[PDB]
Amino acid sequence: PSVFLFPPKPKDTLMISRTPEVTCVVVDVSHPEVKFNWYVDGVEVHNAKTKPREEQTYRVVSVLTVLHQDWLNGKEYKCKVSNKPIEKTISKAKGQPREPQVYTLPPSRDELTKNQVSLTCLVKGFYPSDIAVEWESNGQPENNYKATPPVLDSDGSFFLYSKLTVDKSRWQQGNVFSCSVMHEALHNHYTQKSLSLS
Amino acid sequence: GPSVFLFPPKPKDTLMISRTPEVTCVVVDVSHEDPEVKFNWYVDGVEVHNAKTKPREEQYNSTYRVVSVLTVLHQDWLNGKEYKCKVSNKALPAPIEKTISKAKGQPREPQVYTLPPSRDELTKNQVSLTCLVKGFYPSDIAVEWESNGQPENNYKATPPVLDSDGSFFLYSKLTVDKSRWQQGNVFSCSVMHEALHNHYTQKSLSLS
Ligand SMILES: *[C@@H]1O[C@H](CO)[C@@H](O)[C@H](O)[C@H]1NC(C)=O
């Protein structure tokens, strides 16, 4: 009945050493088997790997490795599911890519009454939405941060915010935190900004 | 065969007295052959009759999407009333029932923090004022911006995101001419949520 076709992880398409994949997820299957057909700009490929079956009905996932440049150039990946057929497609959005602007914002004066404070990373003006944002300090990832999903801005670019939560004492001490952003329009697909008490 | 989805009211509708919150019952994959759907609606088990039936809209794969809309009293949504949709159709062997209500769980008041633009952005012709709303439950909220009495043209909120303590947060970005910011003009983030006193709080932001 139901088919979902996810794109590759942003970080996996921008680092050459990682391996980006398109995942075609079928759910709500009978007790049973399913046929996958895969196409790249209309042309069938047979290198996709089907994962083991996953219960509750049954969930079946097929994973196709994509070439980094095929995705960034924006080839279409089409998944066809046949069973006792539904087609789904995905692709990097068309349009002039745009460099993200990364701004780190310290916590509000008001938040300093709380045991934990929020450090905020604003990433805006970027296209397409595919992006990866991470927090770290002293060359180590932080335990507790989350980002919003990308949101479409009025100019047709995307933005998002990443909220890092830390113990106040750690911020008041003078520790430096850094928001790392990875995106295709960035030189080296990578930029970092820092933020510390001052 | 046909499937049934029941949607809650848009959050801004449940929080403003001038707006019309409604629960929406959506039946998809209704056939061309038997396109007739009977809706029954109940609130805490009592049948109600004021629901509105929308014209069916055909999916060009020769099926219909069929929708019924029940307007809800702001206070009943707020107090935890269950809304029930029962759907009947020739294709179905038994009618299908779905129940929806406001999210259960101890309500929590939003903390509201306005943040100025980063130094770096003052480079630009427009700058971003930011309103961080965190700590809140349930997720239904409304965040708006204004100054000097008027609402602001150019802003957008993220959706609410589930934080790690089981509360929600979200951010609202307001964009303004750098000039307006430099000049000391005062901007206010407003926030409407059930757990706030009078369901409303307001926080300001200027050159500080
Ligand atoms: C027809 O199209 C709609 C719209 O995408 C889809 O939700 C529905 O499942 C389809 N029904 C079919 C193919 O019978």
Residue numbers in the entry:
A (entry chain A): 238 to 268, 271 to 295, 299 to 326, 331 to 444
B (entry chain B): 237 to 444
Copied sentences from the primary study:
To elucidate the molecular basis of IgG deactivation by endoglycosidases, we deglycosylated IgG1 Fc to a single GlcNAc moeity and determined its structure by X-ray crystallographic analysis to a resolution of 2.5 Å. Comparison of this FcGlcNAc with known glycosylated IgG Fc structures reveals that endoglycosidase cleavage induces an inward movement of the Cγ2 domains coupled with a rotation around the central axis. This structural transformation displaces equivalent Cα atoms by up to 8 Å. Similarly, displacement of the C'E loop in our FcGlcNAc structure provides a plausible explanation for the altered hydrogen/deuterium exchange kinetics reported in this region following deglycosylation. We also note that mutations able to restore functionality to aglycosylated antibodies include residues in the C'E loop. The change in conformation seen in our FcGlcNAc structure also offers a structural basis for natural immune evasion by a common human pathogen. EndoS (endoglycosidase S), from Streptomyces pyogenes, deglycosylates human IgG and decreases FcγR binding of antibacterial antibodies, an observation confirmed here for FcγRIIIa.
